[PDB]
Design a binder for this molecule. Structure first.
Ligand SMILES: [Fe+3]
Ligand SMILES: [Fe+3]
Ligand SMILES: [Fe+3]
Ligand SMILES: [Fe+3]
Ligand SMILES: [Fe+3]
Ligand SMILES: [Fe+3]
Ligand SMILES: [Fe+3]
Ligand SMILES: [Fe+3]
Ligand SMILES: [Fe+3]
Ligand SMILES: [Fe+3]
Ligand SMILES: [Fe+3]
Ligand SMILES: [Fe+3]
Ligand code: NA
Ligand code: NA
Ligand code: NA
Ligand code: NA
Lengths: 166, 166, 166, 166, 166, 166, 166, 166, 166, 166, 166, 166
């Protein structure tokens, strides 16, 4: 599963070391997810632009809110969050591609679903890790973030004419 | 001057090619500036944290507002903005360093002043270029951004016990 | 006409008996209409979901506002409103069907138009009855509700690419 | 216990089948609970009406908010919520009775307490099921709903001159 | 009926003379009704005071809003509204009594119901008169005022443990 | 009367043909009325300018709100509203004159009163027509618009030192 | 002086008897003052109407706020406020006259100044009495009311082209 | 009198020593009064709970606002406010009792009236002392606090079916 | 170019004569542009109506804001703005056509793009003229209006699936 | 550990007895924590006062919000919260000291950190106990309170120039 | 011209010396302009006072906003703003006169127009100077201030019955 | 004392002559105090600038609010307020000095404390004078202003690490 792979990678290399590692992974992934959403906001062309464009700002605001909470939780529990664009790009498991105007609306929606599916899996790894290490507060952070990501997947999938397929 | 160097670099490699190039430079530099401000927000320790920390969010919001306006102006005039973290990091003239908690408040304030001084110079290059190519709208964008950056320099310098020294 | 049929059914079995009967019919029909709108809100899939989904909440809020006003007017004039789900389902002239995700956006929009067309006809019966029995207040309630329903039909029809066809 | 009975009934007839079943039970029960609260809003007579009547709207709004969240969580995790008045009435474990103005304020308050006691027990079954099947998000939904129901029981019981007696 | 008596008295002594007369009667009666409501606000003692006292301000605000609309409609259609306390007291069909703290809550509620029952009957006379003289605007004013008065009667009656009994 | 003339002209050349015609007349007349009010807003000179100038914006906003409601009601009932400046100018019964700064405040106020007197008469024709054709919704629209116009006449007349003289 | 006359009349016929008497005088006078202001609001014609008319509502709201505070202070200290229109009219030292549209703007402004001059003198009597009887709270009420009345006199006098002349 | 006793106790053991002492007494008494009000908020059972419970929060907020103003005035004039729970409990003249759910609504209302009667007497002592020592600012603080306490007594007494009986 | 043609026409027939002429051209063109946008608002049918319809109101509000600013700037600098519908229609370079419901969504979007492209060119002529005549204030007005028009073109073009193509 | 000691003390002397005990401990400790924060608010002197002083009100509001939620949860689950200042002082594990102005800013910040460190440990005991006794709702209350306390420790520590050191 | 005289005086006695000088002139002139406007606010008597008096506060707020922006721009670019009342009075080119109540409304309006005409000319000098020295930001500040002053002149002139006559 | 000196100077050269004189002294002193506060706002450099700078705007707004109330009270009671910068500077007992950036934060805070200490003493003279002449309204104005000034002294002193030392 994607979950097993993320776990293995996050824990590859203190009593809360795994929790700190998975939070830092989320710092990098949220920053890249926000960049991807912003690319859709700017590069999209096609019918529906006038409601999809501002929808991207809602998603962006929510991702950046997650980023701030995740990073500060990591600081709070004694860690050190990534805080440069090079660190985000290098350590994120999400890939970016050069923006192009010729991407279709359908392609943008598919990419957004892939991003939130990835984030949902990362958060599940966060749940498993925080349960293991007994960090109830960080467990709750990951639960709320997963729930929000799953709701986003349902809605974006519905726009594509599909079910959530979690 | 820094201005001459930025101009040479921006115009190194259509009727509005230089304007598009300087806007795209600002896309990269604003994204890196925002990342640097966020690092201060997270890593700062020392007396004054409780007002400087939220001040960093004000600065961040303003930089991200500039980013959206600059990128969309570039799209509008027929360009293609950078839209990946790797593109921002590679093409920005601002350098980032790994976050460390041992940086002093004075060091953070000095770095912020350097960032806004750089941005002010970039915007002057934007003014010169848009005057050259006859783009009144983009000229006004750069004017407002420069004015805001200069005000920020005055205030941050005052916190350091210094004059603006533009 | 649908109007003649509704009238006959409402008045089938005091000085304001017909008015009380048509108000109670509206209690049942509004409750079922709200349930139908909610089904669209939940089950819809297809392009346009991201603006149609919240539009369903606007419609729902408006129907529930009508329900409260209609029921309380019925209480006020000496009647007794339906107030169980079984009473609503039994006495409403609107039918419901099990939700399915395979209904198209076009099918949902068509069903919504049928619902508001029905409601508009019921309200006309309300107008005729309240004119007959001299209830100016309840006449005004039905007028406003009809006007709102007719506007809704114009807008939903326009989304379908059609004229209002009242 | 009521909890054991609800569990047996919900699970009577995929990795999250029990969770989907208990969510769908809540869809039906919340819809019936809302109808019961609305009946109190409309039919109540007696001293205290002027503050109890609007209190019923607060309760109604909260139940309908729960309904929307519960139904959409069920959709999100791959289920299909009840979405007709007949389905709600048939599958709910709550009974309704024809409205009558001769019910006392004390009788209405007692019925409301019974409704929230039932809901609290259903949510406990939801907790047990979601723990069993490892659904942290739906577990949190049921926890918050139970906590809110228990608070409501304390306050309504206090109005009756009684302790919460959970 | 009270309606027949009010009509006879209003029309006792131009194309809109009866409409002007019934509006002026409402000017006097609304001013006296407001004074009566204010007396309840000030003199009430007994359980329920803490919600009934502010309820009286809601009623007062609504009566004074009616007064302003009624008076200005009378001016607008070429009349001359009563505008002294002596004119209000003399021409109103409502009687006032010296305030006393020994009136019970039940007595205050009964008096309020009598006031709104009277106003509802006056407004019916307004409806009949404006229909007779073809004044659609003033007819609508009286309709809305009657509807509001009837709703108030339902709610106040409910507080007394009674039905509306219009 | 002006009313008889408007009726004759509106009905000069389906079950709701007269209603559609009078609504379309109002589309043209409201658009011209708004233009006339705007001319006063811009060209006025004289004592009182500082409160009369913003008063013109209130009037303008109200006329444009009427225009939108009237046009959309016409669409809703199966008609086709005028929607070009040439159609408004040609079909309106209101005349416009070239703006001049030498018009007095008194002259502007007199012209405004003439405009609202005309509109009030048009709305009366709307009332008669909608009564004839049984359109309760459009009847209510015209009633509210007439009532608002009559109130405006009272207030503007008062500013001139005169009675409403409807 | 007017002050000496008011004092003599108020105290003409317990440790706070004079304070209760002067508060009750203010209940009657404020109610009559409000009625007089309302008459100006309705009957005024002439240039300036469009700002003077709403100014009358500001004055009215302020007088009614004073009335509520004065009456409730009287209740609070063991008194019984006037609470009928006949009591207000009989015991007030302010006279009212039948409304007429032929009163000039200048006449209305002069009457308003007379009213507030009277109120200011009554409040001075309130100050003297509350100082005598040691009621600091009621002294403060009268001080604030006097200060507000004196400010109103300055502003209304200025509109008349005059100084305050207290 | 209670006033004489409070004075004797406050002044029992600089130019503003008595003023500082009475302010500090109010610090202790307000803190205990707030605790007593909170006990009612939590422990109350009986009809009326649903409006009395939130009323206790209004009272609590007002007492805590008084506490902050009183304490800071004491600091401002050169004193040192009590600032531990033991100091509040020891020096307050108000007694507390263990919470019990078996206290009636009537008992809670009676206790609240006793508390505000005590506070009103303390504030009178504050008035006498600040007059003696020439502290106009602190005199005004006590006046406003007394006036507010007396109003609270009127309203709470009215809920009990009684007059204020100050 | 369109720019050269507009310039020639505007200047065809004082130190700021050309500036006054181009402002007056904008008065006429903005009024016609607003009428065209309103026609789309009313006549549109097809998928997307439910978000495009309110989008037309945003565009309309922005055009009318431009109209007021442009007209008042013209007054301010000593000119006389067009202020009748006939003057707007005659002098505008934009043509209108009779509304028809059979226009497609694509056709409406294309017409809107043509309108804003025209306005953008007019504003460029405004820039050239105000630079020539040394009117910095009116130059800034045209710059902001052009920038806003260009942004609108980007967004509307994106909805059509196209680039801005300025 | 502090956690082991708190557990032993809380459980020293029904199915939810331990949960009730730890909630009641939090009632006492939150009340004392609020008193300590208030002492800092009042007694602080030194550079930074102007932002630290209002920061203390934010902390105070948050502690009092926790207090209300904790106490009402205890009532809800069948307990009886401490509700006198003597009970809070006696049963709290936090000590208070007489206020003195000679405490430094650094001393106040250190004391605040000790308070929140204590609260964080108490909440961990709450987590362990509620897990043991199966109270999911109270577990969530303690989780949120712990998370908030840990965030507060990070921020206050940062103001001191230190890391969180949980 | 006034412009030539201001220029000569400002530049009478670094790369931005003239810009700093003209900004400092504006600091002095804005402070004096605000004082003059305040004198009108206080000393005015005559019909129209009730709308002109608050209009003076709008003007005052706008002038003080200009003052803050101008002064801070001067600081920002390396200057030192006047910051005493004696410096403002001495260096301003505006004269003040002792307040007198016998000035007419017409006289006050004439003086206000003279003030804004002066300010408009100063801002033109600011435009010329900032163009000369290449300060785009300060050029924009002066442009906006001039545009606002010219609009104010149009409106105040209109109140006087005159054209703008710039 | 400073108080004795101010009194002697104010009364050095009608029944309220001394009150008018002390109010006019406050007009001059408040205007100079505002100028001094503004100088701090602009010229301050040093750690804490980012919270002290906006604090100066709060102080400025409060002083200007006092100025307006004081001046208008003086007008109201028959006086004539200073209303030129030269009158303020000449008659104020506060001295100003040329702004310099080399003033320390500590120096600015000390000057602010001196200003408010002076104002507090002036207000005491106002209290003595208004008591002497029997002006209760102006006495209350001075009381509130003194209380506010004393609070400001406590807070500013606390920022300096000192007690209020009134
Ligand atoms: Fe943050
Ligand atoms: Fe954007
Ligand atoms: Fe309701
Ligand atoms: Fe929903
Ligand atoms: Fe009115
Ligand atoms: Fe519309
Ligand atoms: Fe009241
Ligand atoms: Fe405080
Ligand atoms: Fe305008
Ligand atoms: Fe609570
Ligand atoms: Fe500033
Ligand atoms: Fe003022
Ligand atoms: Na009707
Ligand atoms: Na006093
Ligand atoms: Na959990
Ligand atoms: Na420019």
């Amino acid at each position: 599963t994607l979950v097993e792979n993320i776990y293995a990678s996050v824990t590859h290399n203190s009593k809360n070391e795994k929790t700190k590692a998975v939070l830092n992974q989320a710092v990098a992934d949220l920053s890249v997810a926000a960049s991807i959403v912003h690319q859709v906001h700017w590069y999209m062309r096609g019918p529906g632009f006038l409601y999809l464009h501002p929808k991207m700002d809602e998603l962006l605001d929510s991702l950046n809110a997650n980023l701030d909470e995740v990073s500060e939780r990591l600081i709070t529990i004694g860690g050190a969050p990534y805080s440069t664009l090079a660190e985000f790009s290098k350590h994120s498991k999400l890939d970016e591609a050069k923006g192009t105007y010729d991407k279709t609306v359908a392609q943008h929606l598919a990419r957004l679903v892939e991003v939130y599916l990835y984030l949902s899996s990362l958060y599940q790894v966060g749940l498993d890790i925080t349960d293991e290490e007994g960090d109830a507060g960080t467990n709750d952070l990951f639960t709320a973030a997963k729930t929000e990501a799953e709701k986003t997947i349902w809605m974006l999938q519905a726009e594509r004419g599909q079910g959530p397929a979690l």
